[PDB]
Amino acid sequence: MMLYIVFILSVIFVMGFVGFSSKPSPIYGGLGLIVSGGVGCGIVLNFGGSFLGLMVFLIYLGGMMVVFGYTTAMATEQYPEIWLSNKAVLGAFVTGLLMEFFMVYYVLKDKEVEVVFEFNGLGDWVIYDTGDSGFFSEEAMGIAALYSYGTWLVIVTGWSLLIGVVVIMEITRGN
Amino acid sequence: RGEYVVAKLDDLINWARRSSLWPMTFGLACCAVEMMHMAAPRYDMDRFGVVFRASPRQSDVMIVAGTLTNKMAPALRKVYDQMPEPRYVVSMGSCANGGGYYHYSYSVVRGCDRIVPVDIYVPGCPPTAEALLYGILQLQKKIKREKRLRIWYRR
Amino acid sequence: MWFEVLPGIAVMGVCLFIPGMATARIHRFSNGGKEKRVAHYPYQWYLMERDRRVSGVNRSYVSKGLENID
Amino acid sequence: MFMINILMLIIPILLAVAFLTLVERKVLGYMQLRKGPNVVGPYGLLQPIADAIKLFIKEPLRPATSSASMFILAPIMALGLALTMWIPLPMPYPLINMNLGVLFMLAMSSLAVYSILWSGWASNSKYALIGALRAVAQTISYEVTLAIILLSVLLMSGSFTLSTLITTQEQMWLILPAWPLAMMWFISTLAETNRAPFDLTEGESELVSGFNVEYAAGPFALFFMAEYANIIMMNIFTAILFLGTSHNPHMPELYTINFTIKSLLLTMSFLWIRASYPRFRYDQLMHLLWKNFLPLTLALCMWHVSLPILTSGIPPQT
Amino acid sequence: TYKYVNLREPSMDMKSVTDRAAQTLLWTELIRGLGMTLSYLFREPATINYPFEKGPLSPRFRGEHALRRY
Amino acid sequence: MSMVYMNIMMAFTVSLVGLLMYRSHLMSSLLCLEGMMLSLFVMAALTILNSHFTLASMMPIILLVFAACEAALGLSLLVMVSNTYGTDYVQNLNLLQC
Amino acid sequence: MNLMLALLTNFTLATLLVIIAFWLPQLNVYSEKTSPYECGFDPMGSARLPFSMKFFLVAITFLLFDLEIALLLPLPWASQTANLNTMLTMALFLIILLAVSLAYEWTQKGLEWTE
Amino acid sequence: AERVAAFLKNVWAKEPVLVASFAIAGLAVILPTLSPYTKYSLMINRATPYNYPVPLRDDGNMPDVPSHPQDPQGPSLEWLKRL
Ligand SMILES: COC1=C(OC)C(=O)C(C/C=C(\C)CC/C=C(/C)CC/C=C(/C)CC/C=C(/C)CC/C=C(/C)CC/C=C(/C)CC/C=C(/C)CC/C=C(/C)CC/C=C(\C)CCC=C(C)C)=C(C)C1=O
Ligand SMILES: CCCCCCCCCCCCCCCCCC(=O)OC[C@H](COP(=O)(O)OCCN)OC(=O)CCCCCCCCCCCCCCCCC
Ligand SMILES: CCCCCCCCCCCCCCCCCC(=O)OC[C@H](COP(=O)(O)OCCN)OC(=O)CCCCCCCCCCCCCCCCC
Ligand code: SF4
Fold this sequence. Notes:
part of a larger assembly; 8 chains; B: mainly alpha; 6 helices; about 40% helix; D: about 0% strand; globular; binds ubiquinone-10; binds iron/sulfur cluster
C-alpha cells in the first residue's frame, strides 16, 4: 500500500547501506550509497522537506562522482570484488539483509519491536500534523533564516570551508 | 498467408540495413584518399545514409581501402571479428583485391579475401571516388535481394 | 538547396508542439474546461480539498456559485 | 487521462529526437557545401526510421570482460533519466508541476552522469575508461558554475518554480538584464550535454568513441537517444530561462508555437556551433570555467543579490 | 626571400587594449567564425546526383581494359 | 518513534559496524563515514520536519557542510597513503607500533 | 502518485527497449567477437589497473565548493526577510570567502594539473 | 596617479575577465550603502502579511489602533502604491 511508502523507502535505505557496508569494490559501494541517497531524499521529501531531500541527493551525487574518480586511481585492483566474489563480503551482505528481514517481519506482524528503543508499527502516517501552514513552506522559511538568524553559523561554516581549502593543499603538498 | 508476410518483413529489414550502412573508419593506404573524396561534398556519401563510425562495434561495413600487410593482417581480422552482425566487407583497390602492385612482396597479403570474407570487389588503383560509390550502391542492391526470413519460413 | 532542410525542421517542430498542446488540452478535459488548479502551498491545497466537499460529487473542479446558498 | 499525457510526452520526444538527427546531418551538410540525407525518403524524411530499425535488429554483444549488470544498467539509466527531465517543463503547463523544478533538473542532471561513468567502467576497456574519467573532469568543471548561474537568474524571478519564469518575463526577456549570465549559461549547457566544442567523453578523434566504444545495436541507440533528448531539453530550459514567452490562458497553443520556435532555434545553434569550432582539451575546459566563468559568476551572484535590494525590486516569494 | 608569419608586436594604446578586451569578453572572433559557416549554409552545395549525374572525365581516362579490332 | 525511525537507526548501526570492520581498502571505510553522515542527516531532518521546529531546519544543511570537509580531508589523506605505497591498503599503515 | 507513475513509465520504456535489443536480433557469439577493443591489437594489461588522476586537488576542492551551492541556493528566500541589512551582509561575506578560497588555490598553483 | 594607472592598464590588457569581476563585485558592496531605495526593500518585506493580524482586545485606551480595517489609523501603504 502507498500508505507505507515511507517505510518501503526506508527498507531500501537500509539495503543500500548493507550494499556499501559489506565493503565490495568502492565502485559498487559508491552505487549503494547513491541508492541510499536517492531513497533518503524520498523519505525526507515525504515529511515536508523538498529542499532538504533534493539537496542531500545533489550533494551526494557530486560526492560519489569524485569518489568514483579516486577509486579508479587509488582503490582499484585487477578483479574488483562484488557482493558474491568474496565470502567475507557475501557473509556480511547476507547477514545484513537477514537482520533487515527479521526487523521488518516482526514490526509488521506485532506492530511493535523493542531494540534499545521501543518502535511502533502502526505506520508513519499516524504522527503527521493535521493543520495546514499558510502561504509558505515552513522548511524553506527555516532554511532562509540562516542569513538573518544564523549570523554565527555562517561565519564558522564560512571559515571552515576556507580553512578546508588551505588544509587540503597543505596535506597533499608532499614537500 | 505466411509467405506474403515474411516477404514483406524481409523487404523491411533489408531496406533498413541498406539505407543505414555505417562503414568503419578504417583506411590503410592511398585508396583511403579516394574514400575521403567520396565523403567530400561532390559525392557526399552521407546523403545515401552512409556514415563513418570509428568503433567496430557500431559499424556495419568494412571497406579495406589500401594494402594489407602481414603485420597488419591480425589487426584487420580482429576489427572484423568485433563487428556485430550482419556485417559486410567491401574490398577497394588492387592491393586489397589481390595484392596489386605488391603481389610478389615478402610482406604483403595477396588479397584481403585470405583474411576476411569479401562481398564486393571494387577494381582500380585507386578506384575513383565515383567507382567506390558504385560498389556501395552495388552492395545495397545485394542486401536488397537477401531472403533471410523467407529461407527461415520454409526450414 | 538550403530550404530542403526545412521539411526536417517542420516535422521536428510538430513533434515539439504536441507535448505542450496535449497537456494543455488534457488539463482542460480533466478539470471541466479550466486550468488545472495549481497548489504549491498548503493554503491552496486546503482550498482545493474544500472544493471537493462543497461540490458534492467529490470533484474539486466543480464550482458552486450563489445558486448553492439560500 | 494522465497516462495518455505521459505517452503524449515521451513518444513525441522520441520522434523529435529521431528527426533532430536528420536535421543535424542536413544542417552540417549545407554548412559543409553538401546536402546530407536526401535519398532515403523525400528529402531524407525516412532516414531516422531506417536507422532505428537497423540498430534494433543488429546483434548486441556483451564484451567478455564486461560487468554485465552495470554494462546493461547504464543505457537504461541514460534514457530513463533523459525522459524524466521533461516532466517539469512548462509548455506552458508542466506535466508535473513542481515547486522546486529548477532543483529537480539539477539533481537529475547530476544522476545522469553515472550513466557515463558506469557505462565506461563496466565495459572494462581502456578507451571506455579514459572516456569515463573525462566525464568526471567535465562535471567537476561546470557543476559549480552552472548552479550559481541559475541562482543569479532566480534572484530576479524569486522562486525555483519553472512556471514562475513565465511570469517574471511577462514584460521583457531576461536576456536583457542578464545577457552576461546568458552567455555563460549557454556555454555551460554545451559542456553539460557533452556537445562540441566540449564533446570529450566520446571524443571521436581521440578516444575512437570514448565511454560507449564497446556498445552496439540497441544499447548504443539508447545512449544516442539520451544524448539528443538532453540537448533539446537543455535548450527548452534556456528558452524558458532567458527568452520567456507570453502565456495567454485562453490561447495556450500560441505559447507553444512561439516557445517551440525559440527552442528549435537554440537547438539549431548547437548544430551551428558543432560545425564551426575545434575541440577543447579537457584540462583547458576545466580552466575555462574555474578561472574565467567562476570569478565572473561569483561576482554576478553578489551583484544580483544586491541589485534587487538597492532598487527595491525583490521579486515575490510566491 | 623570406617572410615572418608570427612575428608581430600588438599595440598598447588604450583603444587597442580595450578592443582586445572586448574580443576576450564578447567572443567577437568566435562570432566571426559562426558567420563564415552561416554563409556556406546559403550557398548551393557541390553535390552531384549520382548515378543520375556523373563526375566529369577526359578522353585520357584510364578505365577498364579492352582489346580492339580493325 | 514510528517504524521509519527503526530503519534509519538501523542504517546508522550498519554503517557504524561497517566502519569498525575494515577489509583492505581505506576508500571502503571512507564510504562508511559518508554513509553514517547520511543516516544522521535523514534522522535529524525527519525529527525537525515532523516537530515543525522551523529554525532547526538549517541544522541538516550545516551537517552536510561539515560532512564534506571531513570527506575531503579523508580523501586528501588517502592520496598521500597511495603515493607512499601504491595502494590504499590499511595493512601498510603499521610502521607505528602501540 | 503522478511523479512515481511518470518515473515508472520512463524506466519501463527504457527497459523494454533493451529487452527487445537482446532478444529480437540474430546472434552469433564467439570468443574473438567479445574480446576487448584496443584498435586491433590485444590490450597490454588490464583496464582495471590504476589510472592516475592529475586533477585530484581540484576534485577535492569541488567537494568543498559544491557545498557552497547548498548554502547559496536559499538566497532567493533569504531576500524576503525583514533583516535585509544583516542578510545582505552575510550573503556577501559568504560569497566573498568562497572567492578568497578560489584566489588562494589559484595563486598557490593548486588549479594546475600535476605533471 | 601615473603609476596606479599603469597597474590598471596592465591588468586590463592581461586579465580582462578579472578586471570585470572585481569591478562588478565592488559595485555590489558599495551601491547598497548609498542607494536611497534600500530602505524601501526593508519596508516592502515588512508590509507583506504572511500571518494573520490577530486583533487586540479593546480596553478603551488604544487611540492609535483602528477598530475597522478601513479606518484612518494604522500603517498606510500609500507610499508603496506610488513607489
Ligand atoms: C592522408 O593520410 C591518411 C590519413 O590522414 C587523414 C588517414 O586518416 C588515413 C586513414 C583513413 C581512414 C580511417 C578513413 C578516412 C575517411 C574519411 C571519410 C574521413 C575524412 C573526413 C570526414 C570529415 C568524414 C566524416 C567525418 C565527419 C566528422 C563528418 C560530420 C558528419 C557526420 C554525418 C558524422 C556524424 C554526425 C552526426 C550529426 C550524427 C549522425 C550519426 C548517426 C550514428 C546517425 C543517427 C544515430 C542514431 C543512433 C539513429 C537515430 C534514431 C534512433 C536512435 C531511434 C529514435 C526513434 C525511435 C522511435 C526510438 C589514411 C589511410 C591516410 O592515408
Ligand atoms: C570613452 C568611452 C566611454 C564609454 C565606455 C563604456 C565601457 C567602459 C568599459 C571599458 C573601459 C573604457 C573606460 C576606461 C576609460 C577609457 C578612456 C581613457 O582611458 O582615456 C583615453 C586615454 C587615451 O589612451 P592613450 O593615451 O593612447 O594610452 C593609454 C595611456 N594610459 O587613455 C588614458 O591614457 C587614460 C588612462 C588609461 C588607463 C586607465 C585605466 C583603464 C583600465 C581600467 C579598467 C577599465 C575597465 C573597467 C570596467 C570593466 C567592466 C567592463
Ligand atoms: C568591505 C568588504 C569587501 C572587501 C572584502 C575584502 C576581501 C577582498 C578580496 C576578496 C577576493 C579575494 C582575492 C583578493 C586578492 C586578489 C588576487 C591576488 O591575490 O592577486 C595576487 C597577485 C598574484 O599574481 P602574480 O603571480 O604575482 O602576477 C601578477 C603580478 N602583478 O599578485 C598581484 O600582483 C596582485 C596585485 C594587487 C591586486 C589588488 C586586488 C584588489 C581586489 C579588490 C579591489 C576591489 C575594488 C575594485 C572595484 C572598485 C569599485 C568599482
Ligand atoms: S590499390 Fe593502388 S591506390 Fe590503392 S593502396 Fe594499392 S597502390 Fe595505393
